[PDB]
Subunit: 317 residues, 4 copies
């Protein structure tokens, strides 16, 4: 009575009376993620070192060809590509997929946890597919999630019904369901932000951080954690509780994180888990994109922590 | 031509004219690390989940059994065991090994990078082996290093002639030398500390951090990173430069990190790489321990960043 | 444009407008076979040898629980179980599955190629499921095939549309389609039989063997090969051409190979590949079983070789 | 307590007081075999099949590069190379290694068991190293053995003190000693020969085979097995008992199997295990070669079965 991702995705496709097109897409994703996981953990490196006489790029190529081979997609948006990828009519399906094939790639040389992020939209309209099909607010996501290549490889999948966590068993190449209908804690005890940008923070962020270090009601201060890889920091937030923040600063007054393939998928997982995701002014899922590589500030995590910061944001309104 | 850890270790043992006792110890360690890496990556998890037919206890049991079978050790100090472990005479060798089998075990459920830390001493006084044999300053280390289970598994080994990094190719179970004679950058641009303890920081730390966020000469502030796993944070420091700090506070008036199996091995690695490892008042390696589970404050990293902080400590003295 | 088993099985389920029940069954098989493959290649043996302080049976258990977890089966027949396994009504599906979880298990200690064999029937009737549901001639098979754990792991799947070969990539745990719509050679140059039973052969087998060693028309003699594991010998027959034989002798005047889970699946693969499978008197697929563990003589392979022996069988009629 | 090949090899090199040169050679071999096993099992095949981003040539290139880098060899003889390979002086050691990188390469497409055979000689006459250095009788071997890529990967190493079997645990990339000081049964019950050459067999062989099928004393006839892969057939002989034969015929008036890298290593293994290895007229190991690619007839296995056949040869002399 063990549940594999392949079994789960199929039972769910059957409960929803799907034609099996989204099921083929999710299955292709599972496969791409397993292939990326293997390359990240360096299987075969001995060959590069001459035993018998990139990563970001290889990841992009893997996701793009495996997804195109699903015959379920029409428009693909990648952080690595300037322009959206329109699928050849022969393999054109109805889904639009937005992804960051390898997030935190700058951490690659340090061997810190990295990951893959994706958001799936249904093409809403009937004209020739194009970039415009991707420009949907995150509220229209059919599915979203991410894979974390950390001490172990995990796939977190968020759909209308909720959030589920699948652990990769690399011995048999199968994702096993380990956590069902995951719900984030109402209040955590960890805050996560790059405090190296202190001089640049707006007054509301500055004050919140201060409340966390020197609590006015004399409660225990929060612990700090900042891996520097969104997927690692968010996954920790989901599982442990707390808050993650990447607000605006000189690094663009618009934030650093990209809306379509970084913020939306994560905001979607968070909301399905019972938490919040805001830019400080509005909910991330409601922003209407105007550019596929548009950035946006984001704050996400346990609802009580997110609301507390929102209140401060109001005080400085 | 490729160099595996196995060949490198033997070659070095040949040049040093050893009786092959330390060579066996080092081969044993390598085997234990590969075994732990496999467990950490979750191979075989499907069996816990009933495809019909604890990670730190297992790790501890792997290091202990595998080290004893090397017939090269007489005293073992584990973070997991209260008293030192005296090997039976039949299996006695001349080495004392101090290790943390799985560090960052809190971070396990969140899939954050974890690692194994070890330090190797040679039995000095030949009386019946005992706990006191482990009570040697870190300056007396023969070898030290760590295994990081991050996006990929890496083993860093430091000995008198330098520091070398070996990446694990899990396809063939062999560590390949990928970085030779490693040296840390003189000056970095990342600081790593849990600022959630700001309320309890002594003045020197407070000044240094603030100097990093608001550089007097309006230069770029340092970026911040704090994984919460020493092996991860220290490895990023060695590889990319910067400074790592875990000073004394209230909950830990003498620091949290233990001297024999966390601070010493890392201080040794940092020193051979050209960095510094201080308590703020003194070099970590010169401290003569009095308890096997003793704690110590530690600041390590690029020489220029550590020196700068030390200048500040002096100023408040 | 790579085809995985998971993709293939789904497209085929969709072309056939299945409810997705047989698709879930085939997917469970893929998973069980990957798990058996891993245990056969000895992953984890170090643990049995005390690194930190059956196979036939484990295989049976794996197939039985994974199949029962598919919710697509009602009756299971295993070589390892005296009685057929009736599925608990909660997980009862409509398929009957006959399998040998690990064939050639006596070769296990010698590390010779071994394999798994299965035949799938649709329950034909409407009363309580029972052993009687399995007693269908092989001509009523919906699907049949086998997995060979040899120098590499391969899954050969035979369905109404033909035979396809899938190679297991153990790095990503995915079966990849490597040979489509496989057809056996009309005439091969290898014969396979245990000649240690010479004294026991009937006159027709005796004469055929003689024709192969000393060809009456002076053509080159055939080469001999007999691995001793049916799946290995049959797979070689399919891929290379030729004939495989296990006729009657003192080892039961009825042959050794079991009809339901050894001969039928193989006879079915052979026929779909364009070859023949006979007991010498009748086609294997047409025999009406009377016992789930009933044995039957079998001869299979390239059509021209099988007909030649059948002619001799007639001459001695 | 567990014994890995790495530890065993070093331990034996310590007891023998070697300079560690052969120890390095043996560690190199182990690494090369693990690499070949991985390629053979087809890891990464999905890449040949375009998840977008020869086995004997590769094997040959792995053994050669990996052996040269051991700095322990001066002359290499491969089944794949016409002339002996003279290592550059910079990498010269004192050992001559004769090997078949991938034996049974015909059997590759059929996924039948394949293996690697090697024999190690010590350079006797210290003149500039050359081909003649490999032309030593098998009685002069320092070490020999083979790696079998069957259902599991095994390495059999024979040296003056005996034969030991090591099973590869692919999860941790380590060979574990599983059978110590192996000895072959005195008398077996399986004979292995390609009876497809019956027409060309000399009288002695003819009589022996017929004696196996129709034992004069009406005892049980011998079972027959002929995988077609020497490593597989010879390994089953060593492990289960019996006799393996590849005598001279017409297509091969001096046998098919080569003396330096197929017959000698196996004869050496058989002898240390308590079996016999003869040409029919003489012991294989006593033959002084005159060509590096020389062929030789070979009969090996349990002493009683081999003796019996030898008695028969004598009778027809
Ligand atoms: N495996 C699945 N899991 C959950 N929902 C699914 C699945 N397949 C299809 N659906 C749902 O049904 C809709 C159409 O399915 P489809 O015909 O495959 O495009 C989707 O867009 C989802 O809303
Ligand atoms: N593998 C090696 N690598 C570096 N130094 C070695 C090695 N083996 C032995 N040595 C050194 O030589 C001393 C004695 O070696 P041993 O006889 O093996 O106990 C050791 O403590 C080290 O200082
Ligand atoms: N994946 C599949 N591949 C080939 N045929 C299928 C598949 N699924 C179902 N079928 C066929 O359709 C019938 C009923 O499918 P099902 O509703 O799943 O039981 C089967 O018994 C087959 O004949
Ligand atoms: N690992 C070992 N196992 C068994 N014998 C060894 C080992 N190492 C060296 N010897 C033996 O000692 C001789 C010289 O060793 P060496 O100095 O390494 O070249 C060898 O030829 C073998 O006879
Ligand atoms: O994948 P990218 O585009 O290289 O950047 C990773 C992102 O960069 C953020 C950290 O940026 P800072 O260094 O500015 O904190 C992380 O949350 C995100 O993963
Ligand atoms: O869980 P461990 O084995 O005690 O390790 C925790 C240690 O804890 C440090 C961080 O602790 P804080 O949460 O107090 O920052 C790390 O740098 C060390 O890995
Ligand atoms: O799986 P089993 O029941 O142990 O037997 C294997 C079978 O046994 C036959 C060989 O039997 P002989 O030794 O009689 O040739 C092979 O074709 C079959 O795989
Ligand atoms: O393909 P190779 O490397 O030449 O090996 C074939 C050899 O061939 C023998 C069998 O050959 P026959 O087909 O002539 O029996 C085996 O025993 C040896 O493995
Ligand atoms: Mn990216
Ligand atoms: Mn990114
Ligand atoms: Mn620990
Ligand atoms: Mn610790
Ligand atoms: Mn069986
Ligand atoms: Mn069987
Ligand atoms: Mn070869
Ligand atoms: Mn050969």
């Amino acid at each position: 009575n063990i549940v594999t991702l392949t079994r789960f995705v199929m039972e769910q496709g059957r409960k929803a009376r799907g034609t099996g097109e989204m099921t083929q897409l999710l299955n292709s994703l599972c496969t791409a993620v397993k292939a990326i996981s293997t390359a990240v953990r360096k299987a075969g490196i001995a060959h590069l070192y001459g035993i018998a006489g990139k990563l970001d790029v290889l990841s992009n190529d893997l996701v793009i060809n495996v997804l195109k081979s699903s015959f379920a997609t029409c428009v693909l948006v990648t952080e690595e590509d300037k322009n959206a990828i329109i699928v050849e009519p022969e393999k054109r399906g109805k889904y639009v997929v937005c992804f960051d094939p390898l997030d935190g790639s700058s951490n690659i040389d340090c061997l810190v946890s990295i990951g893959t992020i994706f958001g799936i939209y249904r093409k809403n309209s009937t004209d020739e597919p194009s970039e415009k099909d991707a420009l949907q607010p995150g509220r229209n996501l059919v599915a979203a999630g991410y894979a974390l290549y950390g001490s172990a490889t995990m796939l977190v999948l968020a759909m209308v019904n909720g959030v589920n966590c699948f652990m990769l068993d690399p011995a048999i190449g199968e994702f096993i369901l380990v956590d069902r209908n995951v719900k984030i804690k109402k209040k955590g005890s960890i805050y996560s932000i790059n405090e190296g940008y202190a001089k640049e923070f707006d007054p509301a962020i500055t004050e919140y951080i201060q409340r966390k270090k020197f609590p006015p009601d004399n409660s225990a201060p929060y612990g700090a954690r900042y891996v520097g890889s969104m997927v690692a920091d968010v996954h920790r937030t989901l599982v442990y509780g707390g808050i993650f923040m990447y607000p605006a600063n000189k690094k663009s007054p618009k934030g650093k994180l990209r809306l379509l393939y970084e913020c939306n998928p994560m905001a979607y997982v968070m909301e399905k888990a019972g938490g919040l995701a805001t830019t400080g002014k509005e909910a991330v899922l409601d922003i209407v994109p105007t550019d596929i590589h548009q950035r946006a500030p984001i704050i996400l995590g346990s609802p009580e922590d997110v609301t507390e910061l929102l209140e401060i944001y109001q005080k400085h309104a």
